[PDB]
Amino acid sequence: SFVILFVTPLLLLPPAKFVRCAYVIILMAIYWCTEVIPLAVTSLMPVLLFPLFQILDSRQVCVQYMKDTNMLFLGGLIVAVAVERWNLHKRIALRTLLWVGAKPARLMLGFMGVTALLSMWISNTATTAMMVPIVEAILQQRKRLCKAMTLCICYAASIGGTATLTGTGPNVVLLGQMNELFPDSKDLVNFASWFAFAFPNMLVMLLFAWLWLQFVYSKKNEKAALKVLQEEYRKLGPLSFAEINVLICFFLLVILWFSRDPTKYVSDATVAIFVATLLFIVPSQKPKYPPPLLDWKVTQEKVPWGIVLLLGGGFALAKGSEASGLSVWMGKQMEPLHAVPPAAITLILSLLVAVFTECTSNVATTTLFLPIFASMSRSIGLNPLYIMLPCTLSASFAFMLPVATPPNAIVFTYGHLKVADMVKTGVIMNIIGVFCVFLAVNTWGRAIFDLDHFPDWAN
Amino acid sequence: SFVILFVTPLLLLPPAKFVRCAYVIILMAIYWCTEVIPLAVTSLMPVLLFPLFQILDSRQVCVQYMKDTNMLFLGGLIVAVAVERWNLHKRIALRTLLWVGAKPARLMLGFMGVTALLSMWISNTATTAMMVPIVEAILQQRKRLCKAMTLCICYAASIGGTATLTGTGPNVVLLGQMNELFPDSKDLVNFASWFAFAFPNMLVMLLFAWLWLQFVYSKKNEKAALKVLQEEYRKLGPLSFAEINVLICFFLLVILWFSRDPTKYVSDATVAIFVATLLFIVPSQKPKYPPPLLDWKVTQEKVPWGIVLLLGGGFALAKGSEASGLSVWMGKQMEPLHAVPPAAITLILSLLVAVFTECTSNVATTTLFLPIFASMSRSIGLNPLYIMLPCTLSASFAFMLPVATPPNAIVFTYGHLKVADMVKTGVIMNIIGVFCVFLAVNTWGRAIFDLDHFPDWAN
Ligand SMILES: COc1ncc(C)cc1CC[C@@](O)(CC(=O)O)C(=O)O
Ligand SMILES: COc1ncc(C)cc1CC[C@@](O)(CC(=O)O)C(=O)O
Ligand code: NA
Ligand code: NA
Ligand code: NA
Ligand code: NA
């Protein structure tokens, strides 16, 4: 019930400041999981609690809620608002789905491919919310097949969101906590390096996911799917000038992000804000003044400001952990794991994060777990990335439960799914994801991020 | 046109870093006034431009957009969302309007009083947007009288918003820039001290405004107004449990704000966030779990995140002015005004700000002008508050033009007003406001803020 979580754990207030910060973290974790209050309010919890518990005054807590990473996230969100306003993502989805074909096997393959492609660029939640009505209409035109399609959309959304930093919230959390916890790691993790690490691993996960979903789960089906896709594409309209301009702005954003990393002042946030500003200037109509691609009304009503606040609250939580001495204490506690081989530690932590992310949101999961794992990484003399990157990727492995991720909730909302079949698929899904992430880290993540040696920025 | 402002001043890019920061400030001022791009995007301009012009890297610019003041503003906005969701402000307005009476003179007096009272607590824009439909319905049930009522609503909204820090955006700007430009002035300006300074001055302005509007501008009118107010109050419904809980939470917020100032960790932002969090916990319905007073959907759709970004951009602009050396250069330039008596300087600056605020938004006006005036204040050895407080109050004197403030735009939207009559009223309005602010500063502002002596925090 709500009363038991509102009263009993909250009234546990009385010690050492690290104990108080640990209590703040535990209370925020409980509010993340149970969601008695909204996620944004739980992320505002540090502003209330750190000054009260004498860990950080209001100034230091408040200056954590908007950072370089958070501004980059906001710029990406504004660009995504531009993409969704003009149905560019829907156009790409329908065009590629008509290209791949409509026979059921190729149909599922195409849906997963387009969902993962658009998730690399748009929020997992928004990509799912756009894609799942398409299969809803197609299936409206077999219980096993409905499960297969609706599931594979949510799974592909999560997997594809893992590909880029701005694709999903856990990656933004990872970037922000890398800046917060390891300031001397200036640009080691960026759009180019993260893409190089995660895109092959995303492709491997998507391939195994499609194979598994085809393992567990006709002319008429092909014809009906082709008809629905053709109808949707027609009513979408011809390729407009605004859609072309949004596409050009997004290509420019991607090109600048990738060319930033083939005294540094310009960052990925500068590029994202530049492209968003262009979206507020570039005309949306035939010049022949026409309205721009974006106005502030739609931008404000479509940007998830709650997620912005949640990222800021995660940064404040990491700052409080460093200031209160909690990170040092946790490192001292997890020190005797130095004897354990790092591969086993990565397996166990990835499995633990994949289990935990089935209960609360992925972003909250990675927010809670990244500081602890970073503290252990500097405790046992291990490269923090070798622990955090598998943790960040596994936080997105929200496969078992509808409450695991908003894509899963959207997918469950339409029906067609028991929790039993979803968890039966999701357990092998999590096993596959952990395997793929383990290989990605142990093989080519080593070369990309120099996971062999203990870095200087980790002291 | 849009092209001339998008191309010609923007393409002036080439010098010294202070010149580049001055160019950034001038470009942002032009975008504020003309509003070719939305205000939030113009406030994001520092993130794009300071790294490009080598003034501040993206990290330092981005850590300015959420501060203690900005979090306090957000908490106040959330509390205001709670107030507007349950029509508590409308209930207070209708109850007090029925208490004061409906005869035309007392009717205008009551409307101005309730508008100023609710503006002390709610945004000027939101207070105006709620109040003006009431007089629209009343007048629906004389051109001079319509002008009088619609005007006095907007003027009372601005004047009442001057009363508290969270009442209007310029006061939030003043608090934020006082923290940014004068860090050693920790809590000199706070809710209690600002209220003590501005409430008597707000009352004086409102009294003279009512007198002037009665100077320039029956039983049937009284009966019709009373009938409309009674109808609105009936359809408002009886005093609900949620309304009482929102009222109690707001009283608690006010009491904590005033009792904060009869190593400091708790600030006004901590109190505001605490009360907002309570609003997300406190039940809105008879317990007999019922939904809380606020959920995040309405909070996100009702909070003006653009204004949050604009305040952050103002803080970043002040930070860039300090870092680039522009503030020092401006102080050197305005040094030879040390011979001018401070009272004359205050008069001229208040008149200049009152003139400028007729063109762009009040918040943008005070954002642009406060750093320059602070630099001059430390140039000529004058108390910065003696210049900034009249500047902050005069920024709210948006009386002449509909584009001067969103309350003025809302008021002009309903009609009943030429620009000619509005400016004719507004010129004497600005004269009255400047007079009242001059007296407030020269008399009791001196005692409250120690305006006589050059403070230590101003170096
Ligand atoms: C990029 O982040 C987001 N953007 C927009 C919205 C509306 C929500 C989010 C966070 C949720 C998630 O990160 C998945 C999860 O955390 O379960 C996702 O990518 O949709
Ligand atoms: C408290 O600030 C605000 N809150 C909410 C909204 C929607 C807008 C604002 C800023 C505008 C103004 O500050 C007046 C002006 O600047 O002209 C006001 O109080 O409405
Ligand atoms: Na995504
Ligand atoms: Na999750
Ligand atoms: Na107000
Ligand atoms: Na103005």
From Swiss-Prot, chains A, B:
Keywords: Amelogenesis imperfecta, Cell membrane, Disease variant, Epilepsy, Glycoprotein, Ion transport, Membrane, Sodium, Sodium transport, Symport, Transmembrane, Transmembrane helix, Transport. Inhibited by (R)-2-(4-(tert-butyl)phenethyl)-2-hydroxysuccinic acid (also known as PF-06649298). Stimulated by Li(+) in the presence of Na(+), moreover changes stoichiometry from 4:1 to 2:1 Na(+):citrate. Changing residue 324 to L: In DEE25; loss of localization to plasma membrane; loss of function in citrate transport. The keyword Zinc-finger does not apply. GO terms for biological process: alpha-ketoglutarate transport; cellular response to lithium ion; citrate transport; fumarate transport; oxaloacetate transport; succinate transport; transmembrane transport. It is linked to Developmental and epileptic encephalopathy 25, with amelogenesis imperfecta: An autosomal recessive disease characterized by subclinical seizures appearing in the first days of life, evolving to severe epileptic disease. Affected individuals have profound or severe delayed development with lack of speech, and most patients do not acquire the ability to sit. Additional variable features include axial hypotonia, peripheral hypertonia, and abnormal involuntary movements such as dystonia and choreoathetosis. This is Na(+)/citrate cotransporter.
